[PDB]
Amino acid sequence: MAVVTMKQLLDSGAHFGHQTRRWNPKMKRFIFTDRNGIYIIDLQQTLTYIDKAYEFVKETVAHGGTVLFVGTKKQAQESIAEEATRVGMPYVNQRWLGGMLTNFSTVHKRLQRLKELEAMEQTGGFEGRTKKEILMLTREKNKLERSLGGIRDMQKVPSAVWVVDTNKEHIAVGEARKLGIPVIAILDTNCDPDVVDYPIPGNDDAIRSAALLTKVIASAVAEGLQAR
RNA sequence: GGCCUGUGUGCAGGUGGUGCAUGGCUGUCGUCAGCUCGUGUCGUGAGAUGUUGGGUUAAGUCCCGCAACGAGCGCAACCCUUGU
Residues A182 and A185: their CA atoms lie apart, in Å, by 10
| Cα–Cα distances in angstroms (integers) from residue A30 to residues A112, A202, A213, in the given order | 44, 10, 17
Strand nucleotide closest to residue A107 (CA to C1'):
B69
Total residues found in chain A within this entry = 228
Q: Is residue A93 within 8 Å of A150, Cβ to Cβ?
A: yes
**Technique of determination:** cryo-EM
User: Is A172 in contact with A165 (CB distance < 8 Å)?
Assistant: no
Angle at CA A78, nearest 5°, toward A134 and A228?
100
- In chain A, the largest separation of any two C-alpha atoms, in whole Å, equals 66
Name the nucleotide nearest A148; use CA and C1'.
Answer: B69
Which DSSP letter does residue A129 get?
S
CA atoms within 13 A on the CB side of A20: 9
A41 neighbors A32 (Cβ within 8 angstroms) = yes
Residues 6+ apart with CB under 8 A from A97: A107, A147, A148
| Pick from A90, A22, A71: nearest CA to A169 | A71
On strand B, nucleotides with any atom < 7 Å from a protein CB are 38-42, 62-70
C1'-nearest nucleotide to the CA of A100: B69
Resolution in angstrom units: 2.8
CA atom of A133 to C1′ atom of B74, Å? 21
User: Could you check: is the Cβ of residue A96 within 7 Å of any atom of nucleic acid strand B?
Assistant: yes
Phi and psi angles of residue A153, each rounded to the nearest 5 degrees, phi first:
-115, 20
Report CA(A139)–C1'(B58) in Å, whole number: 24
Alpha-carbon distance of A68 to A71, in angstroms, equals 10
